[PDB]
Design a protein that fits this description.
- The PDB classes it as hydrolase.
- Keywords: non-active site mutations, indinavir, hydrolase.
- It forms a dimeric assembly.
- Comparing the Accumulation of Active Site and Non-active Site Mutations in the HIV-1 Protease.
- The structure is a homodimer.
- Chain A is mostly beta strands.
- The first copy, chain A, has a single domain, classed as Beta Barrel (Cathepsin D, subunit A, domain 1).
- Helix content of chain A is 4%, strand content 54%.
- Chain A contains one helix and nine strands; from the N terminus they run ββββββββαβ.
- In chain A, strands 2, 3, 4, 5, 6, 7 and 8 form a seven-stranded mixed β-sheet that branches.
- The longest helix of chain A has 4 residues.
- The first copy, chain A, starts with a strand and ends with a strand.
- The relative contact order of chain A is 0.27.
- The complex binds the ligand CC(C)(C)NC(=O)[C@@H]1CN(Cc2cccnc2)CCN1C[C@@H](O)C[C@@H](Cc1ccccc1)C(=O)N[C@H]1c2ccccc2C[C@H]1O.
Chain lengths: 99, 99
């Protein structure tokens, strides 16, 4: 579908059997969620954003359903005021910016 | 323009007679630049991002040309690792997300 930007670009997702809302964020290179549980090993990682850096866990090859589309990718879990779907996963559902 | 997301969605803009590049960022409600000079009065403002808060100057009704389109809006100036064009200006150039 097409989404205008008068309101935050929120989409419902299913990840690790949990349901969450996340922002389709073209300004984010990666995908990050606050408080969700993922299984398996992970690698520590620090991502930078506006306001500073945050230490997160990096989980690879994680299945995630974005607004109905089933894809798999790297997902970060760590402190964030909003769950974000980055470009790493937006390219998988074929999302584009248009004007 | 349609823009895919395999690479950062950068656009060249002109604001206050200065040229710079900025990220089309659907995850940002506001527009912020670091390292630019704007004229007139402004109001202090705390902005929250992924890594914490940043103190910035808020300038209203500032003309800005984004990828050739001339619009006007609120622009923040303060510490940021990347210039960002938020939803407040993307709606003015009719930018939409599609998938
Ligand atoms: C991978 C990771 C997710 C850490 N990336 C980012 O946070 C990038 C960082 N770059 C920079 C970078 C840093 C390090 C290395 N390369 C690049 C600048 C742009 N952000 C993307 C932003 O869109 C993220 C949002 C997150 C958010 C949404 C809603 C509520 C809270 C947090 C963001 O920063 N939003 C805020 C925001 C942002 C700009 C202007 C106004 C406002 C207000 C608000 O919407």
């Amino acid at each position: 579908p097409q989404i205008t930007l008068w309101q935050r670009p929120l989409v419902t997702i299913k990840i690790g059997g949990q349901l969450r809302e996340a922002l389709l964020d073209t300004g984010a290179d990666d995908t990050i969620f606050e408080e969700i549980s993922l299984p398996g090993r992970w690698k520590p990682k620090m991502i930078g954003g506006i306001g500073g850096f945050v230490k997160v866990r990096q989980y690879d090859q994680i299945p995630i359903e974005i607004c109905g589309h089933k894809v798999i990718g790297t997902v970060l879990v760590g402190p964030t005021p909003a769950n974000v779907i980055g470009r790493n996963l937006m390219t998988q559902i074929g999302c584009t910016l248009n004007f």
